[PDB]
């Protein structure tokens, strides 16, 4: 399309469009050319005699008179594009219309996404400034002062409105450039702390622990030893049914102090919990109905995950069958050092306790150590004997 310069529909000539200044656009219809002078530009040139008489500096730069693009003119232009043309411009008419691309209104986001104490968030201070400046223009124009300020004042508002969306613009002139950095919208989407990389893909979780690791060669290669103090914090919500009813009663009677005990109940119908510390009675044990859930402690045989933080290959995180033991550190059989690449020189490892029967089945079947004696890179064994067993 760019090759053409005459609108065939009405024979209307058009010139080049180009950015004349930062966030400022100009069209070049009334341009002089090295070739024969266009009649239209001669008619446009010859009309400034009045101002040329009033002011002398018009004469030197009468050749720089072009068509400046202002939000008003673009808006009142775009509004008149005909319906049949839009899809050729590749913007789907079900998604929007060009006339609305230029903005004249804004939403203030809810208070949820900008808390009270940042005192208030910078988006709030930005917004209160926008309205302040807007109120300035409307009273100022009503006050009927000279034109020059009216428009200059509008450029700073234009820049401030631009600066609200994003706070990186580098073209700001010296005498109004921000002295301090600020969180525009993209700044809270982008970045390593942004939503995508910080809160959607990888995020913080609960029902997990962390501690030093130390050796124990009397655990089977697929078991891990857990301290009692961390077994008393973590829970699993076992539903009551015909087979585990008697067991869960013994756990309830122990309360939250003797280890094989429990911490809460959730009634089948009235969904309020019942903190076992203040039960006043064992009678909750008798009242256990099918459908209640006991949040029991961790007990021997539960499937727990096990992870070392700089994870490089899929054997970095693996399932284990827990056993509960008295000291203050996690313990596992040294044959399993090589997957994790741990060394008992002050290391630490995490642990997670999956909360769903569906997640238990996957952890055991897919992520168990027994199913992962060999590395998928080339099939060689990775869990084998280490030093002092070879000797």
């Amino acid at each position: 399309c760019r090759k053409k310069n005459i609108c065939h529909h009405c024979g209307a000539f058009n010139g080049t469009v180009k950015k004349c200044g930062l966030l400022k656009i100009i069209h070049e219809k009334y341009k002089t050319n090295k070739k024969v002078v266009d009649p239209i530009v001669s008619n446009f040139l010859q009309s400034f005699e009045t101002a040329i008489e009033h002011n002398k500096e018009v004469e030197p730069l009468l050749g720089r008179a072009q068509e400046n693009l202002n939000p008003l003119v673009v808006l009142n232009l775009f509004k008149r594009i005909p319906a049949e043309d839009v899809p050729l411009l590749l913007m789907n008419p079900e998604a929007g219309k060009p006339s609305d691309l230029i903005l004249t209104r804004l939403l203030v986001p809810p208070l949820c996404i900008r808390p009270s104490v940042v005192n208030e968030d910078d988006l709030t201070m930005k917004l209160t400034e926008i309205i302040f400046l807007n109120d300035v223009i409307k009273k100022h124009r009503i006050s009927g002062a000279k034109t020059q300020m009216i428009m200059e004042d509008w450029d700073f508002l234009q820049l401030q409105c631009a600066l609200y969306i994003n706070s990186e613009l580098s073209g700001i002139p010296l005498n109004m450039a921000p002295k301090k950095w600020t969180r525009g919208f993209v700044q809270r989407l982008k970045g390593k702390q942004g939503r995508f990389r910080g809160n959607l893909s990888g995020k913080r979780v609960d029902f997990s622990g962390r501690t030093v690791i130390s050796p124990d060669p009397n655990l089977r290669i697929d078991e891990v030893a857990v301290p009692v103090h961390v077994a008393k914090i973590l829970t699993f919500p076992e539903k009551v049914n015909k087979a585990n009813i008697n067991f869960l009663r013994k756990l309830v009677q122990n309360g939250p102090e003797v280890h094989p005990g429990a911490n809460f109940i959730q009634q089948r119908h009235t969904q309020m919990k019942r903190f076992l510390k203040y039960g006043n009675r064992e009678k909750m044990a008798q009242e256990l109905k099918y459908g209640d859930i006991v949040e029991r402690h961790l007990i021997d045989g539960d499937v727990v995950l096990f992870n070392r933080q700089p994870s490089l290959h899929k054997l970095s995180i693996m399932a284990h069958l827990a056993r509960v033991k008295p000291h203050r550190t996690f313990r596992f059989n040294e044959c399993v050092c090589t997957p994790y690449n741990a060394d008992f020189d002050g290391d630490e490892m995490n642990l997670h306790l999956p909360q769903t029967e569906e997640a238990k089945a996957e952890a055991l079947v897919l992520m168990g150590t027994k199913a992962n004696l060999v590395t998928p890179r080339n099939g060689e064994p990775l869990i084998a004997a280490i030093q002092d067993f070879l000797t």
């Binding site: 008149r80 005909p82 319906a83 049949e84």
Partner: protein, 245 residues
């Protein structure tokens, strides 16, 4: 052109009804396209689309054109849908220039969209029967006289006609009959001599076959432009000067 599209929807609703409005607005929104995709887009029975298109082309609202690969394209012009608003003005100035018989001729012509001389004069006479009573009657003679006078003065202009089948492209017909417009006979009325006394609602073959006609909208626009110019002149200096202009 969105306001305009709203006017199209409104006047289609008021003139024809829902389904006609729907088809017309969608077509003026999407441009020239073949039938099958229109039926797909609308989702209604193709019978409805077909009937609406027949009615629209009868009034010359939409136009169909043969297209490459043998498909037929259907199109509408936005300007044409902006004219019924002027029909009152048309009838007023025609009543100003011609007796009520010319008014009825023009009314029937616009309401039907296309019609031949014999049937229009007959329908005008029939619809005039209730405008005189006490044994008064009329013949097709006066109605024909008014019609030929109107056609001579260019208010009435002939519709397009088909090319002759036995002359052009003998054999199976093409998808569309590809009508052609002839200019020399635009004001050439065909001939008849039949006369009939209209029936006064007592509740008790074509010589001009195929010669259809339609009002000349451009003549009316020009005539209105002339009246506006004269009105400007009359106000400008004087009644005498406007009578001169």
């Amino acid at each position: 052109t969105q306001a305009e599209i709203k006017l199209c929807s409104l006047l289609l609703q008021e003139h024809f009804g829902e389904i006609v409005e729907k088809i017309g607005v969608h077509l003026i929104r999407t441009g020239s396209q073949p039938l099958r995709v229109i039926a797909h887009d609308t989702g209604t029975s193709l019978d409805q689309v077909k009937k609406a298109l027949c009615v629209l082309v009868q009034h010359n609202l939409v136009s169909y054109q043969v297209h490459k690969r043998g498909v037929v394209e259907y199109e509408a012009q936005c300007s044409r849908v902006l004219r019924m608003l002027r029909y009152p003005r048309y009838i007023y100035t025609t009543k100003t220039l011609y007796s009520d018989t010319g008014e009825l001729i023009v009314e029937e012509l616009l309401l039907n969209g296309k019609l031949t001389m014999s049937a229009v004069v007959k329908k005008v006479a029939d619809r005039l029967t209730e405008t005189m009573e006490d044994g008064k009657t009329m013949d097709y003679a006066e109605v024909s006289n008014t019609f030929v006078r109107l056609a001579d003065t260019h208010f009435v202009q002939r519709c397009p006609s088909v090319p002759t089948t036995e002359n052009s492209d003998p054999g199976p017909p093409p998808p569309a009959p590809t009508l052609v417009i002839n200019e020399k006979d635009m004001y050439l009325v065909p001939k008849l001599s039949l006369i009939g006394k209209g029936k006064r609602r007592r509740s008790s073959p074509i010589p001009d076959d195929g010669i259809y006609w339609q009002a000349n909208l451009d003549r009316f626009h020009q005539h209105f432009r002339d009246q506006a110019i004269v009105s400007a002149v009359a106000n400008r200096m004087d009644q005498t000067s406007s009578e001169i202009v």
